[PDB]
Here is the input.
Amino acid sequence: NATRFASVYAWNRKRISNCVADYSVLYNFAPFFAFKCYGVSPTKLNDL
Amino acid sequence: NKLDSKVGGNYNYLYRLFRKSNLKPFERDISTEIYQAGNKPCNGVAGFN
Ligand SMILES: *[C@@H]1O[C@H](CO)[C@@H](O)[C@H](O)[C@H]1NC(C)=O
Here is the structure.
């Protein structure tokens, strides 16, 4: 929920650590429509 | 890759990653019943998540 994302060439990098992630709230708070993942399935992301 | 890749991309060989339980040994799953990962029920040809 940023005010605005960066440009494609000055692409904005940010590391996430020392914290618990839930991708369920990541989508459920805010509707969206593009999604594709390699090396993992969108469900199994929740526990590895 | 010589005999079976395609210049436009060989999309023929398909595989499954979404199933309720793990595949049992000496068994094959040809079924393509729309699987649902999302919290709400999904139906028809497709559903969200
Ligand atoms: C994003 O943050 C704003 C406040 O800056 C808030 O009003 C808004 O509800 C947030 N987004 C969502 C989808 O809740």
In short: The interface with chain A takes residues 17-18, 37, 39, 49 of chain B (CB under 8 Å).
